[PDB]
Amino acid sequence: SQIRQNYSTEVEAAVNRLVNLYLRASYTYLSLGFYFDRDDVALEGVCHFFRELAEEKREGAERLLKMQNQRGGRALFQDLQKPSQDEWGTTLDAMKAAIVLEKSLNQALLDLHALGSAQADPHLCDFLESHFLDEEVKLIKKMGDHLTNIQRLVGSQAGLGEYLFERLTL
Amino acid sequence: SQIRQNYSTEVEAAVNRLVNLYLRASYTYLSLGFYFDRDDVALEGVCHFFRELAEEKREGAERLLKMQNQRGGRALFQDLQKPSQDEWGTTLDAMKAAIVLEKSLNQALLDLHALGSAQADPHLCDFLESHFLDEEVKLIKKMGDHLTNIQRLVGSQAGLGEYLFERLTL
Amino acid sequence: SQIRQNYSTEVEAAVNRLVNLYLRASYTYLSLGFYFDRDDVALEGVCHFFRELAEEKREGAERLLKMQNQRGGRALFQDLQKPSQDEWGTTLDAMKAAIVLEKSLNQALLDLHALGSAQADPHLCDFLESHFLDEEVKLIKKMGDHLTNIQRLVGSQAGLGEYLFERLTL
Amino acid sequence: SQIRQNYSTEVEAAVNRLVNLYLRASYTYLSLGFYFDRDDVALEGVCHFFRELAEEKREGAERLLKMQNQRGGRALFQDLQKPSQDEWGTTLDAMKAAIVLEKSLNQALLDLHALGSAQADPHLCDFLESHFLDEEVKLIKKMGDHLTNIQRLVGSQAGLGEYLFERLTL
Numbered sequence A, B, C, D: 001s002q003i004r005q006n007y008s009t010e011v012e013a014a015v016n017r018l019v020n021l022y023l024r025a026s027y028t029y030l031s032l033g034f035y036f037d038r039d040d041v042a043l044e045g046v047c048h049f050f051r052e053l054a055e056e057k058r059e060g061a062e063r064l065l066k067m068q069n070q071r072g073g074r075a076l077f078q079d080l081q082k083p084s085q086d087e088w089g090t091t092l093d094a095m096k097a098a099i100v101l102e103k104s105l106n107q108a109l110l111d112l113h114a115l116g117s118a119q120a121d122p123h124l125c126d127f128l129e130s131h132f133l134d135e136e137v138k139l140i141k142k143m144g145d146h147l148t149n150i151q152r153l154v155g156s157q158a159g160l161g162e163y164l165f166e167r168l169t170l
């Protein structure tokens, strides 16, 4: 590649794997959101929450793919593993699942940072720090807030608390 | 009739019976809504829900009657059977009743479709598919959502959940 | 399911497979568009073409998923097969590939129509006819137009014609 | 200097040399742009391209000079070497030259990053990452796009392709 400069094949491969990870999370959020749209689940607010996460993680991957081209790497696409569940239980269960998912993207984001730093790629480090590293911390905090408030409500009246959280928070 | 063309007497009779069915549902929703307006029931939100269903099913019948004239059939009017109940119990009971009612209009709508199709009346099929078939599926889904959320709330605090649903959903 | 009515398990399974097909096409268009964004390919116009197809087929699948819930079926998600190619050659090759892809969705759409009709599901037939059947014919025609104009331009000056089409048509 | 803090003489000297490098590139772009304004060259679009690069690299150096003062270093000015050519040939040749030039600023930018990092100057690293590191990658990508499109057009009709690129891209 004529434009390629200071872009290592170790990093380019990582970005490709991270594109795959973001798309699979976006796929998971798609499943999550449409499950709460079920007539036997019927939690409007929870569905819109996970559908916007699906979009956000999709724009995240499109951002990586664009950066891949700006640096002179070749995007390579793999199969998208299906979501780990077909039914996600309650809001508390869904939220729990989401937080583990975000914590594993964040893990992947940090490893890719440590990689690009050992490779002395300051532009990659700057790209992850602005568009990704901080959004991921804000989101996990916001998700943790939700977990604490759901666990409070589910406490005695499980069915009532799920309704109140969806109406009054989401 | 001079304008009549490809309009069978089997179908024309069906439309007349379906006019009668829609009017009787609109009558039922009228009863339902004014029952929740009772001082000993006093659920503003539930009353407005059923009154708008009463109007919607009334416009539905006026639509059939107009189509009847556009095709060259003769509208014939029968007695409107009174609603099956004088008192409708709780929101959960009312909703249950409504869903059975909508499911029987939808049944009538599908039979009238199957009839007009066997008669090779493509215009009737198109008329039911746009103005009726899809509204009826949306509505039953929306009603099912309500049932799931009421059943969640009525769970432990029956009286409290009825209030919250009416204030926070309707 | 309480809301389910006139919805067969044969059809519900088809919709799920068609959700999968639309997502995999949307995945393909994602690959196609980002390939033309390559510095060694550099055809802005062709990239934006395929990226909007990626979105459109994604909204298409979200539409099916929403309809699945409105009818009382359960959405089930499978793995997304990766795109058939990693590099797509020229505009003429990409366009050729796209048309075969659209022609196979359209095939899937027609089979699902024939299925829902034999099952006497008039609402499914109406849903495919408005939101899908006509968009798919318009698109294939528009794609065929592009093929004829590319084949004209690639005729003598392959490299020049690709530039002119991208600047003057896309 | 009273305000100086965590600012090493190795780095301050680098910034001064990089000021000189940016000014000499801005000088080169000045030559490039006014050459395409020649009546025997007459490529309006190519001239405006290189003149805006001349400004941009000039603002870049003024930015370094301002940062030098904010940190407490002393700006020292050297002679500006004249451009390497007096006549730059075709658009393809000019573009080739530009890309090598940008790739050598980017090289200088990365070395100055590696230097300030080994010196543990996090503010310098942040200054290069926001105002310079990313602009330089975007630009080289954009320049590579241009090279691919020129090489496509120059293919058979060299004189015609130069005109079309200038009219339809620049």
Ligand SMILES: [Fe+3]
Residues within 6 Å of the ligand: A006, A007, A008, A011, A116, A119, A120, A121, A124
């Ligand atoms: Fe690297």
Ligand SMILES: [Fe+3]
Residues within 6 Å of the ligand: B006, B007, B008, B011, B116, B119, B120, B121, B124
């Ligand atoms: Fe008929």
Ligand SMILES: [Fe+3]
Residues within 6 Å of the ligand: C006, C007, C008, C011, C116, C119, C120, C121, C124
């Ligand atoms: Fe069916």
Ligand SMILES: [Fe+3]
Residues within 6 Å of the ligand: D006, D007, D008, D011, D116, D119, D120, D121, D124
């Ligand atoms: Fe320093």
